[PDB]
Every structure is written in C-alpha cells, then in structure tokens.
Coordinates of C-alpha atoms and ligand atoms in Angstrom, one line a residue:
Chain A
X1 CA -4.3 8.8 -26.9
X2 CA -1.7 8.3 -24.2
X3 CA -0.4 5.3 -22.7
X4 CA -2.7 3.1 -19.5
X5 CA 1.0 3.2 -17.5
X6 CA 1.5 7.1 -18.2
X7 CA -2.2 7.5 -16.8
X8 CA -0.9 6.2 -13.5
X9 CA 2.0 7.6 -14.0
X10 CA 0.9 11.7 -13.9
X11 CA -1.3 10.6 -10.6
X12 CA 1.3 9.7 -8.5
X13 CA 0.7 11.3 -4.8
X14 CA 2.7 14.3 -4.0
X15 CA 5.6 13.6 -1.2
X16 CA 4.3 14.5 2.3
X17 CA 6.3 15.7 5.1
X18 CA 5.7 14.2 8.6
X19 CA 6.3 17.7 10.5
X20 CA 9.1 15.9 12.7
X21 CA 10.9 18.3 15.4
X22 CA 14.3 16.6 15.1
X23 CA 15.5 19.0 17.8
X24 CA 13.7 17.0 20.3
X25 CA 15.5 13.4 20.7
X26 CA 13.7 10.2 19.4
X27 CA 11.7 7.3 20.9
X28 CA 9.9 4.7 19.0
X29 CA 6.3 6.2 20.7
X30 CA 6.8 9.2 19.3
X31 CA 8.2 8.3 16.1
X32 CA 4.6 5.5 15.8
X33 CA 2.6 8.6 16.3
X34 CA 3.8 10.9 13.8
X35 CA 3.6 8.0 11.4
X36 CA 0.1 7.0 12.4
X37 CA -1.1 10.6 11.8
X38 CA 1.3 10.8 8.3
X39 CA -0.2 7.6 7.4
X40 CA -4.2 9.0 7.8
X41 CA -3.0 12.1 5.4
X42 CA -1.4 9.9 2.8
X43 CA -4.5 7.2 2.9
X44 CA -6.7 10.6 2.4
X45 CA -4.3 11.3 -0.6
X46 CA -4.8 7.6 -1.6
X47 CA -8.8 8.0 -2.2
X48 CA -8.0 10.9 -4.5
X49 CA -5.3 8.8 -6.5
X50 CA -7.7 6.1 -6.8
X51 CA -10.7 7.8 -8.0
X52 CA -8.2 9.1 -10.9
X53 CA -7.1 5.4 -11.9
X54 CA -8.8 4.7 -15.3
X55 CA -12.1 2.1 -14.6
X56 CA -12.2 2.6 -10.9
X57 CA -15.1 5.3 -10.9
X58 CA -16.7 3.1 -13.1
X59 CA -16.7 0.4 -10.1
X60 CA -20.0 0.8 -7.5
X61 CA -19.4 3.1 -4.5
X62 CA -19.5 0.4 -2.3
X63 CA -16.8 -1.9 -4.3
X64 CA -14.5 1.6 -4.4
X65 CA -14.8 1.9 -0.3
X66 CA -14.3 -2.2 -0.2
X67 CA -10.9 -1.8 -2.6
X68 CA -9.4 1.3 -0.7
X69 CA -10.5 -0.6 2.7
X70 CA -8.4 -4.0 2.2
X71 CA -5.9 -2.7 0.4
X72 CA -4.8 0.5 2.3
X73 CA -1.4 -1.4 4.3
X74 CA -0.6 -3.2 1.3
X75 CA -0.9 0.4 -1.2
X76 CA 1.4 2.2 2.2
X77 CA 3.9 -0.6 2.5
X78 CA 4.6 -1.1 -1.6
X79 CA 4.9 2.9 -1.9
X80 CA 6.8 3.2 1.0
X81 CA 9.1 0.1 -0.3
X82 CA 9.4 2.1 -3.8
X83 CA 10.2 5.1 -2.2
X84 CA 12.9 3.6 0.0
X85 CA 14.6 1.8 -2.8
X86 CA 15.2 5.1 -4.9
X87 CA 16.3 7.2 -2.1
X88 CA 19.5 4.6 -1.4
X89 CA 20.3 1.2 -1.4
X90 CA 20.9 1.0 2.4
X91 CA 18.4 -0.4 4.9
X92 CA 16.5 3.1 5.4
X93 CA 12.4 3.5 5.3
X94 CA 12.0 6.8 4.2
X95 CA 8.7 7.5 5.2
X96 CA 8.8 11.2 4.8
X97 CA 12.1 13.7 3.7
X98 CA 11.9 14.9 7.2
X99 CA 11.4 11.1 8.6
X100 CA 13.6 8.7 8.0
X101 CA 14.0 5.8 9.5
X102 CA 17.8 4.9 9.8
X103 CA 20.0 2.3 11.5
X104 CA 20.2 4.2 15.1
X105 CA 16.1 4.6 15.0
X106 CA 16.2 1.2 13.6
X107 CA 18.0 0.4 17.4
X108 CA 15.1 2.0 19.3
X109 CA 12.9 -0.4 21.6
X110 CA 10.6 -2.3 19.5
X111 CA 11.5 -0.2 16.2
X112 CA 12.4 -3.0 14.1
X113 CA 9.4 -5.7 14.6
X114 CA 7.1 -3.1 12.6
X115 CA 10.1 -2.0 10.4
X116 CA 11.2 -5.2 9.1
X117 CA 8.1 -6.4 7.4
X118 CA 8.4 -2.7 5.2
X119 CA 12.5 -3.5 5.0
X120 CA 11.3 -6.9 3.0
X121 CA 9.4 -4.5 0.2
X122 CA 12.3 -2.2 -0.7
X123 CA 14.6 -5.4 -0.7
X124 CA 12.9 -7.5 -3.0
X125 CA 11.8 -4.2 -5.5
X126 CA 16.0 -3.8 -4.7
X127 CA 16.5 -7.3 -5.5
X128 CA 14.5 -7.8 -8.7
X129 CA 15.6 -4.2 -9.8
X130 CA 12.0 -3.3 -10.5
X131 CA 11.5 -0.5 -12.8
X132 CA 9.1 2.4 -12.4
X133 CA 6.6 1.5 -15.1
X134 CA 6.7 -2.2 -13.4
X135 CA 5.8 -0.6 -9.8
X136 CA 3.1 1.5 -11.3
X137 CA 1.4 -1.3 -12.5
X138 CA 1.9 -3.2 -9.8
X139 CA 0.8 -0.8 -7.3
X140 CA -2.7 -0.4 -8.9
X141 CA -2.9 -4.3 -8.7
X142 CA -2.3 -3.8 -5.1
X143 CA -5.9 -1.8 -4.7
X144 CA -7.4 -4.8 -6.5
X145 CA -5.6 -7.8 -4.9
X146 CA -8.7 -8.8 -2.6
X147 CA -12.5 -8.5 -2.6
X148 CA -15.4 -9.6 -0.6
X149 CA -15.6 -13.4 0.4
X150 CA -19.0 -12.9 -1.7
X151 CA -17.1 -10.9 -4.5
X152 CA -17.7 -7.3 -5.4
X153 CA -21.3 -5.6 -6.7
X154 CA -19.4 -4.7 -10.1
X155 CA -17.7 -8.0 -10.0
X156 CA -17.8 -8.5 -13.8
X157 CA -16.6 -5.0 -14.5
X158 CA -13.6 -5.2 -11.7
X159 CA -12.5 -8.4 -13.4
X160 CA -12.3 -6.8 -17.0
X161 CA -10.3 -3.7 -14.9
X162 CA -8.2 -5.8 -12.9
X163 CA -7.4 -8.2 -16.4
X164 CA -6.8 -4.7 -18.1
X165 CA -3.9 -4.2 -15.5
X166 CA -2.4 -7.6 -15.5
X167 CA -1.9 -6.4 -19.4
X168 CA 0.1 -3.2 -18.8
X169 CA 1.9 -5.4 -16.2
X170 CA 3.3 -7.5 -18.9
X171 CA 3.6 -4.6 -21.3
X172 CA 6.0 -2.7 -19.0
X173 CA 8.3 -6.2 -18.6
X174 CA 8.5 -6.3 -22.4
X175 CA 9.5 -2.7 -22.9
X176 CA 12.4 -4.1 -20.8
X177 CA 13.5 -6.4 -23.8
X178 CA 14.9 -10.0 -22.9
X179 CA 13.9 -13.2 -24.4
X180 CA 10.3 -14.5 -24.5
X181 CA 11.7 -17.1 -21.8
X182 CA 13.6 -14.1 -19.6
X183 CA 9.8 -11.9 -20.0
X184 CA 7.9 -15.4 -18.3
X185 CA 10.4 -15.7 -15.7
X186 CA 9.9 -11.5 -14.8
X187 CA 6.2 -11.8 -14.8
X188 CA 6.8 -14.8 -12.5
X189 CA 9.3 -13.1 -10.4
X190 CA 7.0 -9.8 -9.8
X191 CA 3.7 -11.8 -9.7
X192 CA 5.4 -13.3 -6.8
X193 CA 6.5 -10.3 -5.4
X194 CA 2.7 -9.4 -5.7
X195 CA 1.2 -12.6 -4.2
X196 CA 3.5 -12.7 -0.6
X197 CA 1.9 -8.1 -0.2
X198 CA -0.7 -10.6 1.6
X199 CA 1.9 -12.1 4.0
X200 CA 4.0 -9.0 4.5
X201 CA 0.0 -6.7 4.7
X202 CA -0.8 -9.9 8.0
X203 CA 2.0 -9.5 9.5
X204 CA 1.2 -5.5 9.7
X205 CA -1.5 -6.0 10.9
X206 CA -1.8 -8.0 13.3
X207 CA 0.3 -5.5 15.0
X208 CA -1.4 -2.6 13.5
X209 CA -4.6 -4.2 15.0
X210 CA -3.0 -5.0 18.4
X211 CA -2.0 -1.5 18.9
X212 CA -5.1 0.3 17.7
X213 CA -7.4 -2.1 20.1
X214 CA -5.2 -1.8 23.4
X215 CA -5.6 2.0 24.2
X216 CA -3.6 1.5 27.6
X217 CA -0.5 1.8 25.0
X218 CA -1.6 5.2 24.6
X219 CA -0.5 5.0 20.1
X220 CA -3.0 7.4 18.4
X221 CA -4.6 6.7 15.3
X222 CA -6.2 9.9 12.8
X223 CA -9.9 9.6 11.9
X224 CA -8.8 8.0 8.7
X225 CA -6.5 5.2 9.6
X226 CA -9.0 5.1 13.0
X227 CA -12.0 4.6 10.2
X228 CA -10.0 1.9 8.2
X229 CA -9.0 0.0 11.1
X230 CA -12.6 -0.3 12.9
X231 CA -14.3 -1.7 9.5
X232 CA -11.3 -4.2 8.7
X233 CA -11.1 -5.7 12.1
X234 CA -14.5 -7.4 11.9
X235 CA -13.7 -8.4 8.6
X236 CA -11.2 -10.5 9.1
X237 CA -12.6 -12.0 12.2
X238 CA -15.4 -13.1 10.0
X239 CA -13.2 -15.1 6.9
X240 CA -14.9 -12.1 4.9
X241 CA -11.7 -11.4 2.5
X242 CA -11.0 -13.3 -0.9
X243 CA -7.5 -12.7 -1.4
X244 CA -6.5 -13.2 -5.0
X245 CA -3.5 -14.9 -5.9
X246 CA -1.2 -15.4 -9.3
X247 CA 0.4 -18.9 -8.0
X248 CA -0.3 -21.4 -5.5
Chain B
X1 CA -20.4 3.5 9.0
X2 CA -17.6 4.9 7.4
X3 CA -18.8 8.3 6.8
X4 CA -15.0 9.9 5.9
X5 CA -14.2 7.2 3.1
X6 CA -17.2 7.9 2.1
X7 CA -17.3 11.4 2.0
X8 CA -13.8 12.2 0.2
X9 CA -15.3 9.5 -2.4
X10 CA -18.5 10.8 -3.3
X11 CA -16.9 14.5 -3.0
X12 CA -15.7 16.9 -5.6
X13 CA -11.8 16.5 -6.2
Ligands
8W8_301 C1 7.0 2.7 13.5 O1 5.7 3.2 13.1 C2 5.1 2.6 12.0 C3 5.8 1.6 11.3 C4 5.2 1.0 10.3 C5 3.9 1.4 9.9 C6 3.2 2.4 10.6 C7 1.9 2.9 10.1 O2 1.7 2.6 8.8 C8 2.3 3.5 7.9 C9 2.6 3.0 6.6 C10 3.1 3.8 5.6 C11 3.3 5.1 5.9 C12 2.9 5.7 7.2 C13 3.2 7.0 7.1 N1 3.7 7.4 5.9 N2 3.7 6.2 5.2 C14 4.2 6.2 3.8 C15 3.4 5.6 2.9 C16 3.9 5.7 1.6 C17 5.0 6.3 1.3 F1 5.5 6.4 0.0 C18 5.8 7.0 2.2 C19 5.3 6.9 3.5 C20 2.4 4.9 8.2 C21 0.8 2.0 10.8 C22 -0.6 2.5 10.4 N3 0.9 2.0 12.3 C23 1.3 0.8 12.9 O3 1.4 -0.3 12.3 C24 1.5 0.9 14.3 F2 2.9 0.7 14.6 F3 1.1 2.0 14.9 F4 1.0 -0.1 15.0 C25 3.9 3.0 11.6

C-alpha cells in the first residue's frame, strides 16, 4: 500500500515547453500571449492530474468542474512558484525551460505588475524552505481551497477528502523532525502561506479579467483559459465563492 | 456551458 503524498507525487504534470522563437526580440505582448496559450495546455494537463488525485473522481461531476474552475490561477501560480524556487534562488519565473522570465524581461513595459504577484509565491516557498512532500500537499489543498457560496453537491464527501489532505499536510511537516512546538509553528507558517493563494489568486485576476474582457488590447486567450475565464467572471460578480480559510 | 471542462472530464484518460 503506498503512501497518500507518493500518490500525488508520481502525478505530477510533465514540464511543457512554450515554443518561444528567442531569435525574434521580446515585448511584454508577445511574451502575455505565449503564456496565455502555455497556460490553456497546462490547465488541460491540470484536469488530467486531478482526476488522478485519490477521492476527487469520487466527488460529483459538477463539484469536479466547480474545484478545477476556482482553483485554476491559484493551482498555475503555486506550481509555477515551486518550479521557480528549484530552478535558482534569483528573482526568475520560469514558466517554461524555453521561457523564462528574467530581470531584463522583468524591465519590459508593464512586465512586472502581472509578474510580481507570482514573484511573492516562489519567495515565501524560498523563505519557509518548503519541501517537496510539503508543496504536494499543499498544492492539492489548493484545488479544494473554495466551493460554492451554497457549498458543493458532494459536500460531505469533499470535506472527509479535503480533512484527508490537511492530514498528509501535517504528516509531511513531521517527517521533517523538530519539536512538537517547532511542527505547530510549520503548519502555522504554511497554512498561512495557503490562506493569502486567495489574495495573491485576486490580485491575478483582476488583471487576468481586465485583459480577457477588453479585446481592443488585442491579448488572446486558448479555448481553455477562454472557457475558465467566461464561467468565473459571473461568479464573482455574484458573491458566489466561499473561500476557505485556516486562520482569521 | 463549459463543454471543454467538461469533456476532458468525463473522457477516457
Ligand atoms: C506575462 O504574462 C503572464 C503573466 C502571469 C500570468 C499569465 C497567465 O497565467 C499563467 C500562469 C501560469 C502559467 C502560464 C503558463 N505556464 N504557466 C505555468 C504554470 C505552472 C508551471 F509550473 C509553469 C508554468 C500562464 C494568465 C492566464 N494571463 C494573464 O494574467 C494576462 F496577463 F494575460 F492577463 C501570463
């Protein structure tokens, strides 16, 4: 029988490539695009990671669309924060091996505003030195960090799956053995962490939003993202997201 | 609605 963590672990999404020409020179326009259209391949690979997590089949269709839909930015921005903070401890997003976002693309016009929010992931997994088995946890509490104002139709069911997590959460802090006072303080610290995904996930957003719905800016979206986007703005309009939280 | 979600949900992996 092997371990919940190592379930997660082996499902991990292969790294995609963002099919950058580097011979042609930057701009932030066409470096938004290529992400927009990386970004609908690695969501696609994010429904295929999901339906692999242990419980989540179990959950009714409509709760599994609901899950994938609020979560999507906040699963994107904590991978891409994990992924950043292994590659090097500099301030690079490395959104794809053949895409990365360094400090003279972090110069382009309007580059950073986007880039910053994504910056604060990979320094606080940095900061708090967060180990792989921690992140793993952590990113499948991401997919269930908010439901339905109303809740979800398996809402007993995603509660006992979502508990289930918190539990492997805590098991991968202990495995890192410190005091029963230094294990409280690390569940704390990355609960935390967990908790402000919502504010960093806004602040996405609202730009994500503004840029989808103002087609004079000319940023194009893939089916997927395009699909994601058009649900979720409604949604929000209408107060209909329950956002869980660890503290207040 | 959101017939792609949808359909790489309910489809065969
Ligand atoms: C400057 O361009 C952007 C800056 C920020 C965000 C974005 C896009 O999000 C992501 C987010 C994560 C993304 C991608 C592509 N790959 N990964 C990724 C995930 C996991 C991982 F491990 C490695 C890589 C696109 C959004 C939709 N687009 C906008 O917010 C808007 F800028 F277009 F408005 C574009």
């Amino acid at each position: 029988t092997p371990t919940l963590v190592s379930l997660l672990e082996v499902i991990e999404p292969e790294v995609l490539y963002a099919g950058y020409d580097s011979s042609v020179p930057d701009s932030t326009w066409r470096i938004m695009t290529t992400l927009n259209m990386l970004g609908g391949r690695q969501m696609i690979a994010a429904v295929k990671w999901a339906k692999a997590i242990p419980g989540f089949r179990n959950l009714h269709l409509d709760d599994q669309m609901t899950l994938l839909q609020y979560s999507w930015m906040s699963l994107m921005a904590f991978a891409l924060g994990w992924r950043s903070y292994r590659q090097s401890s500099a301030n690079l997003l490395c959104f794809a091996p053949d895409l990365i976002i360094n400090e003279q693309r972090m110069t382009l016009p309007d580059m950073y505003d986007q880039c910053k929010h994504m910056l604060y992931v990979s320094s606080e997994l940095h900061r708090l030195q967060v180990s792989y088995e921690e992140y793993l946890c952590m990113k499948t509490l991401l997919l269930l960090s908010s439901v339905p104002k109303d809740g979800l139709k398996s809402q007993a069911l995603f509660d006992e799956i979502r508990m289930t997590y918190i539990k492997e959460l805590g098991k991968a802090i202990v495995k890192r053995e410190g005091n029963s006072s230094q294990n409280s303080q690390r569940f704390y610290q990355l609960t935390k962490l967990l908790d402000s995904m919502h504010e960093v996930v806004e602040n996405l957003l609202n730009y994500c939003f503004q840029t989808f719905l103002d087609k004079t800016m000319s940023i194009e979206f893939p089916e997927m993202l395009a699909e994601i986007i058009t649900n979720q703005i409604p949604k929000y309009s209408n107060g209909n997201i329950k956002k869980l939280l660890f503290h207040q | 609605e959101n017939a792609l979600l949808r359909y790489l949900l309910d489809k065969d992996d």
